[PDB]
Design a binder for this molecule. Sequence first.
Ligand SMILES: O=C(O)/C=C/C(=O)O
Ligand code: NA
Ligand code: NA
Ligand code: NA
Ligand code: NA
Lengths: 444, 432
Amino acid sequence: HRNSLIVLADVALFLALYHFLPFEHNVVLGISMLAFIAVLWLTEALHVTVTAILVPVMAVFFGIFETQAALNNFANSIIFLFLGGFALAAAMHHQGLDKVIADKVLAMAQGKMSVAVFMLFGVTALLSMWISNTATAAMMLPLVLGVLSKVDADKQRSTYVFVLLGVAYSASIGGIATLVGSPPNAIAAAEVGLSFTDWMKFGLPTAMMMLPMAIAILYFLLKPTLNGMFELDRAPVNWDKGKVVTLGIFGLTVFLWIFSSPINAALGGFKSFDTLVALGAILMLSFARVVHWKEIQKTADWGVLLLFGGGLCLSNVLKQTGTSVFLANALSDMVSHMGIFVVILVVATFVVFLTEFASNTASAALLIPVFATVAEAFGMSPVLLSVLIAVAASCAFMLPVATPPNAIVFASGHIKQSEMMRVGLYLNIACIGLLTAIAMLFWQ
Amino acid sequence: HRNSLIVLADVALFLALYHFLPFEHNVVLGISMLAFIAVLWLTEALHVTVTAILVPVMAVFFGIFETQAALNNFANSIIFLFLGGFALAAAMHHQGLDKVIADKVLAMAQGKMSVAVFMLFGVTALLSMWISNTATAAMMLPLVLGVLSKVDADKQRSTYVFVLLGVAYSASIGGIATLVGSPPNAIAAAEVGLSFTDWMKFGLPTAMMMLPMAIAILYFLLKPTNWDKGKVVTLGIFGLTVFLWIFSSPINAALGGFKSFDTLVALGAILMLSFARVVHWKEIQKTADWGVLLLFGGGLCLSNVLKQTGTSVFLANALSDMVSHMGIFVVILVVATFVVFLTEFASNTASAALLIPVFATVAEAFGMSPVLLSVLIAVAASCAFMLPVATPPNAIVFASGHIKQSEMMRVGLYLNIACIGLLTAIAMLFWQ
Ligand SMILES: O=C(O)/C=C/C(=O)O
Ligand code: NA
Ligand code: NA
Ligand code: NA
Ligand code: NA
């Protein structure tokens, strides 16, 4: 098979780099490993999580760490803060609080495709802030195909592709608003030690800008939906048992997540307060009987939770072997010749296009450690590159295979490959600007 | 709701013990917490895992530990050693290697009900060694009901309940052979730091003995009776994993002495199984019981809450005279007896999650090897044989809408007493 070969080709690459690199053994090991993992995660010949589990089992056998010390990465507070976000999402889906949020808002538009689709995007993004990205897409597709049936003429495609590609992007832009939403955010927060409200100060404003900037680009390429009528055909929804409760807990949780800084300070200064709140939410939702555990076990992506640990293990493997400082020495002249504009532009550009070929999180899982630790060897705060890398990681807008949401609206069997491949090629450039713009603004 | 009250009553209980107990404040906290958690886990007002997650958020807020230090319990090497067993199960089930293991064995009996039912038990136990207990029962139930169709006499119950209660017990007794099999076993290994081959030297002989003793009691009551793509690979990988797990002691030592070698072997299996393409991760993620994996961490955090607060030494001091008045026989007989019946009323693992920390840490304050009480407790925890709701395998063969509550309650009442003897018997021999 292909992937069995990519692994074999990668295994050879490691053995080659291992015996032939002419540096201090620690650097040779860290270099060989970083290459090995980079392939397995970008090619994905092996499952992201399988590669994640491979990270510790390597460091342990090659004397970098001891077994228990390596595994301890998989229990970082962010993992549980993310697992708390999973149970918080699983709750309002099994409860239907996502459905009622779509109807009550989508019915606010009386019957206009103009104010409908503009409401479909705002809801898809708002829902990605807390639930997910791949999950929010599948939940929206039937609601879009339902609306896009009055103008059911396929020969009227562009009226019916603008709404499909629009939500698939709003789900990705929504995941850039909060620490929960896309693993990349958690990978950055866990790498540089970000709080929920810390990452929101970065991503949310960026998403505020990217959503209009993204619709404008979608609008002014082939919008033909001004006229149209609504066919809300199905049983309406209605606030049932504790859908207000889930909203209350949710709102309460997000209130503590936002006001965690003063709440925690005016409480004794606990360590991972946001992680506790995420764990506290898991409790309230269970005491309030609103969600069973079987639900969370399905919704939770334990592979990403395992990936989180694998990514932190890598970050620590780069340091212990000095590969973080060795690469900073290697880039000394190169990076001194470059400006930080070129850097954040090269990085942003590199990822915003790199994420088109590989998984969103699999890209951050590899670059967030390298750039953060190398930025550290340079004595630079790994926050900027990490948040930057983590944000541009969720900027997959060209071909599918970049993000599941892309392949979700593509399986609708209507939007042409070429159609998507070129809207993202424009949006990618748009973000490289906005990001480098915002990345420059978020400086002083 | 019923359970919603237990929680409220338990919060009050904590406030009461907290405000009214007159001991060093730490003992009040550790005692209050131990009671709080003890209720939540035996009553199950909250899901086992919800209570487990409640442990760290408690210790963290009540200054016992720091958030990250508390959470670090959920990454113990035993947890990952068990996750390897899950991928090892998901592999050979998604491969179908468990069914073919039942067919190849079940057809070896030419056409005899006498040798038929006796073969259904041996496979349920063999499959519980590696797969699970609730899963081994549900996986066996269709295969068990299938045999009981030639002689389908309805009011021929005892001919048709001995085979149902036999597997429901063989699934629970089978899980006492290896560190993978039943969560209680893993809880002991994580508490006292046992290796895979260490726990097998203890449990496997006991499982060798308990299975016949269990069928004999059922017998002598009213008994009137293609190897495809890489199924050899799954079998190969599996065998390789178990070979390293057994010979891990010399293999690891003759390699540089890695720390949690069994955990490495367990994680290596997850890798071999994935490189060999024989099982996808979505399979491993489904078969894996992440709730139990989270529970493992919660139980270790409690154990550390008992020590950090001194409740282990306070209870060791409180039980000082009582245990000195008792022989070690009297102690392990009270203990063994205490659980073998407690496991009838509460979950198998929920019993070990609470008793293994308390007894192990107190036994340690006595300067005693906490292995015996811990391994003992973990074994007697899987001795639920009376009423249903003791173990899913019990409630699995019970949902057949045929086996009477009283019928099971008195065959198990015989097995329970039978086990209290066997356990205390072996527990006494395993001393010097
Ligand atoms: O291992 C199981 O399936 C169940 C264990 C228990 O409930 O004790
Ligand atoms: Na999201
Ligand atoms: Na991607
Ligand atoms: Na088992
Ligand atoms: Na039980």
